[model samples]
Target chain A: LPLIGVTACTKQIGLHPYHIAGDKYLRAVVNGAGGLPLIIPALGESIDQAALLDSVDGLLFTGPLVRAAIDAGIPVLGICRGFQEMNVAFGGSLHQKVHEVGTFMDHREPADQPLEVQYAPRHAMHVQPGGVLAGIGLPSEFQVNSIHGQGVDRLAPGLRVEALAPDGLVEAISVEGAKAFALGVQWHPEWQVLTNPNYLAIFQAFGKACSKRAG
Target chain B: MSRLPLIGVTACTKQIGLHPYHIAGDKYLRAVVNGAGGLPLIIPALGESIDQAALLDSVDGLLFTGSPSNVEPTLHDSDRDATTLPLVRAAIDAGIPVLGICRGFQEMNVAFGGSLHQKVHEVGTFMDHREPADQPLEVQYAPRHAMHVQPGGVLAGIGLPSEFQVNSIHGQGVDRLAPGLRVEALAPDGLVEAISVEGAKAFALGVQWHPEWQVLTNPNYLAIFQAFGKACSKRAG
Candidate 1:
């Protein structure tokens, strides 16, 4: 199985520090992507880039390693913060608070809601015609969870839009002329990956790309 | 004018004024600039938030500083602030010159799949390597024992005598050296005190003593840093 490196966040669990990767993300990589998942801890500059890029076939919801992966011919799948990171990595800016924008919709999740309710589909996304999403078996229109406050403002020059929110916000993007699977999505496709066909397809595509690279 | 190679010194996570901070000791930075003749850049212990690829693209050498914190045993079992372990492996794999001191020496070992004796004093054969308690800084860091530099090793390449006096301040020492590392020097008690990555492409050496201290006054210490600097310069070219 291809080794998929999942980026992790630093968090304090009680008094001890830990590098945390969401369960859903790891599960999606295993059950949906068919790749062995490895957590790439966010050690910032302390991380060894060459060694890390060499160890994995693909990356998930990661930013710092995106450019290196792309340069190294490794596949990448960015989600939420990762999506923003990809944009920033490519010289694009972001609307720090999307809701505060006069014409943008409030993309933040409903506060004080149950976990399932918060992650439930809350908005419709328009799949770009002839885009990677469409090619991946996604319909022209579909519902997706809205759980982020920041949104892409200036789409990176080399990125092609794959999907958009009803308010015209970029929901998905793919690197132009990238040799391998390089993509970013603003919503949580890994949330219910095993049960959702659409989410499963995204990871499957990523896995297939990674396996090809590994070979 | 020749451009001096930029050497990155690893920082440790410390708490001050109720908040955590990434910091490296001044002596390490000074040694790189004055002794090694390279520019020093502090690499913070901000786990995962840093762009490592970009960092590697920017630096020619890496210096892992000795920290007060011990390498968490669990980090080796599973893989903290002990982030230096991965950083050590990364630098070695990238073929960058690396110099580790005290805590860093142990990190390079553990990073290469070697184990450590949490307390060398606890081991019957090993001498008490800890510094004297309640002593002044000079006394604590004073040379307490002699180390035997292996012939033809990195330390020996510095043209220093096989045996030399060095300060002892660490309680933990190498229990089993990593397979990929070769012993460069050892304490009189046979405790491994210096090492170099076996067959490393660039300058890769780690010393158990604090060479960054009084680097200019000590010819042996100065030679080590100069050798490291020269290797970094070759990479910079």
Candidate 2:
């Protein structure tokens, strides 16, 4: 199995501090693509991103250590926070709150609902033809779950919009000229990758790309 | 979804409110199983009475949970491992998927001819594995320290780095790895923290950390459960 490194952030949930990463990303990468999902903590100064990227077959950005992978030419797959991270890595800007952006829907879910329901499909997106995402069984228009309040306000140069919602919001994007696979999605497919074929294919494709670089 | 794998999680008995009760700590294990798309079945810790092979015949997978109790010395013991060891052997023989966690991780080592340190040195390079009792449940089991994973081991295959952080809540650890068993992970102090049967026909893994709690939020832990879930699903086929 290809090793997939997942960058993580620390949070205080119930009582003690937890170095956590959203479990859905692990599920999608493991169950969907047969990859080994390892969590990489975002321990600022203590991190060695160069050495970190050198160990894994690919990088799945959830928090930090993305730039090192980008320069190292390791395959990179970015979801929600990751997508924003990738965009920022490429010199793009993000809307701190997408709802405040002119006409963009409030991308955040209801704070009270259960996680699964919160991750339920919120809207549909129109995938542009002739892109990597389009090749991954992504329909011209497909449903997606939204939980992020941030969106790419100024897409970085050399990146092309791959999918857009009905409201013209950038739902997915891909690097135009990267050494290895580089892709990001504003919405989360890791949420229901097992049950949803479209989402599963995205990870399956990412896993295959990662496997190519496996040691 | 129709053929969700059935996973039998072993249970520990206790006396609660004037009645002998069967219980399993952490509802999160069930949630983790369900989240992985497996049906959870609580298997009572009934030694001798439990037909290990028969139970294996019924369930698609087996899960050995982390427990609060220690495995009594080989001389005098409790129901601990008396029944589980047989089931572990039977499950391995049958190629049924099995996952052992924490104390369950210790049992797997013992089942395969390994021995354990009743308590890892309280004052040594190795930190005490047990948590402070006064802390809340989450604090007691929160991710505390880093574990160094063996390269090319089961954990490495799952994408764990050579070293990663995990929660610790046990007094015992593998002192000697059993024959035909591969080291999966180790504590910073070099205490064996995880292992996998060398030639198991199905998905068999053991980890010294509690991957059960907060599985809903941690992708790395979710992968463990989901991988087990996938193995069980294949077995159901």
Candidate 3:
């Protein structure tokens, strides 16, 4: 089994996304997917990217303030902050205020409305005709949760779109043929995975890929 | 009644599988008491009702430690699996000034109405289950680390804040705030740093981080000794 390294912040200080302390949702998603969750505190000064990658089966860019890709060859996944990181890491851009583009998305749906954080199998996202996301029989459009102020703009060169929000915002993305199975999503799949296992397949798929490395 | 009392708490996990003499609680019993305190006693497993009954009347306060196996989730109606017998419920009913560390936090939750998250990824994508090695200090939540205290809670009454940092090593945490339990300090990531029962005057604490293991590095840990001493003192009086 591959151990996943979680970057956590020191509570002796306060909360930081880099620190995985209070985010119960993210933790469950990774664990349910069958991977070891190691809390990786912020590397104070001695930045050793190789050793960091060696610690876990894969890299997941947890939500909030994603830093640059430390090394080019390591496998990595980006969530909301992650989806935008590849762009920031490579000088790409973002739609910044995704809703400012003027959307009636009742982003804060009261649950009565199918569209509220709505898991209502919206329109099919053409996952750019596959690489990693292939074979999972991902529906043309699967219900997903949308909760971010930013989304992908200029795609990070080698990555492909795997899912999208109803507003045409890119919901999920992945790097092609990378040794590691890394991907990113604009929405919170962690929460979805809690209630829906199929929703978490996205995470398990990566874990399955990692299981091959064996101790 | 003359053992003058220094109690032994469980260190739990890794050392738990070892013999009674090899356990962390036994280790602490010898190291923590300097003759200024009383005798050091052990909290045997859950099935020892006679031991439990006797300890209730003899042991001055409660000292909880973590175990090798995770606390069974069924204890809290949680979906997480468990391999060990539950102890917190009994510990809670005993109502002594308690001190829990490592798996102790999880025990506290089950003792109350809260449950565990089962599988969580506070770390990264696939990096749990393994031991703490092959990574930077950041990769491991230090076994001997420092933590600030919340003077408003039990720790405050004991005056431990601004005086110590904590050393913590555990995967489980107190997910839901149990009823009447006041959370004191927290890890930088907001994990429950320390806790106390409602209106606790002695030490009804459950810390997610470990102050015992880190005690050798930071002398302030004696504050726990002081707290334990006071707890014992109140009962003796």
Candidate 4:
């Protein structure tokens, strides 16, 4: 079984009747990609990070409150803050006001609250000659769920823009010839995939990526 | 017209196969019911375009749920970074009217500028963390969990004693608390078991015990739920 993990914010806020820390998306992502989702909780500790990372077969990065990979160079999917943290680790910067970038590209169309099928349906500017995004599943003109105020201004040295907005703002980026299925996008496809993006197909492709890593 | 208290819960797309397996409460809907409020009805874990003031207008409280990843310390601007929590930012943004239980508790604290204890045993806090304690073995009623409540705190005001007998199952503890977030209860040697913020009536607070599950055995927890429910109704009304 391929183990995939998604990162969100911390698990500190207490539980409620409807309280879910959202391992579902990771589950949904894994199932869509053809992997087993392993929902991890907050380490909130100092030494638990390595142990948690080491135990996973392959890594799946979801929306995190902070950017990670400050040091660990692993094959993980970086989303909203995931990209921010990874880029920052690779010496990148966040736009801080993702809205400006969203407006420039007209991406951030969805509502900020949760569990609704609300879609802004912004046009994801595709720019890569051949990348995981523009070529694989979603064509050069598919839609994606827009959120996040911060984005990758300068990708890691080995990474390049797989897609972009009309404003030339980076929409999706790919790590140049990554050893694993290392790709990330600014839009939230998994959260609002129902509106746009080949969510299940894309997840299956990502799953194949995880399986390939096993080999 | 009854305005629904806009409670925000944590959720991942796994409900629809975004990840894998199955995750429970992290979704927005269940959180509202569990927290003794109206409905979480929304997922603002990212807090991106979320209008906190507006949502707060609809919400009476917040429930920080558990997830698969850890809150990375870097998000809090820390050099002692050791963990990577993925969804905590949304939990922290809701501020004090949030209660953190178990993983939710850890996430809540970290989001509010606190750190985690990671593994409890290594830090010298006596706990059976390595063991799978959340099983039937730990499932007994009659005040199954026990913790010493800090005397003279807001918890005391709620008529809870200096020591609360809460359930036990987790390995992590609070390394640091968000400023002003008080420690209401803890393990004998001071491992945090429950925490709460100041003012705001039923604002932020949580415990390690699975009170919702245990509510069948002990009705006392209904107070917490009822308190949250009242807050929700009040906010709605």
**Which candidate number would show the highest DockQ if scored against the true structure?**
4
Report lDDT (CA) for all predictions: 0.79, 0.74, 0.52, 0.53
Error of 1 at A154 (Å): 38
Best-matching candidate per TM-score: 2
What share of the reference contacts survives in each candidate? 0.00, 0.03, 0.00, 0.17
* Leading candidate by lDDT: 1
Q: Return whichever of 2 and 4 wins on DockQ.
A: 4
Rank the candidate models, highest DockQ first.
4, 1, 2, 3
Tens digits of per-residue lDDT, candidate 4, A1-215, equal 45455543443232322222354364355346655444444333422354445434456565421223212434566665555665665566767665565456434544544445443445545556777775675666655556665666766676677777666677666666555566676765566433344655556666776666545
lDDT, residue A38, candidate 3:
36
Instruction: Assign candidate 3 its CAPRI class.
Output: incorrect
What lDDT does candidate 4 reach at residue B105? 73
Lowest summed-lDDT stretch of 10 residues in model 2 chain B? B14-23
Candidate with more favorable, higher TM-score: 1 or 4: 1
In angstroms, give how far residue B85 of model 1 lies from its true place: 1.5
Candidate 1, residue B219: Cα displacement in angstroms equals 0.9
Give the least accurate 10-residue stretch of model 3 chain A, judged by summed lDDT.
A11-20
lDDT of 3 at A73: 38
TM-score for each candidate, following the candidate numbering: 0.53, 0.54, 0.45, 0.45
What TM-score does structure 3 among the candidates reach?
0.45
Give lDDT tens digits, candidate 2, residues A24-64: 56556668776765555445554344544665678777644
Q: What tens-digit string does per-residue lDDT give for candidate 1 at B1-237?
A: 125676777766544432344455656766887888876655556445344555565568998877667887722211134357777788888888999999889889988989889989999998999989877767877789998989988888779898889998898889989998999998989999999998888889999998887788888889999998998888888
Q: What DockQ does candidate 4 have relative to the true complex? A: 0.08
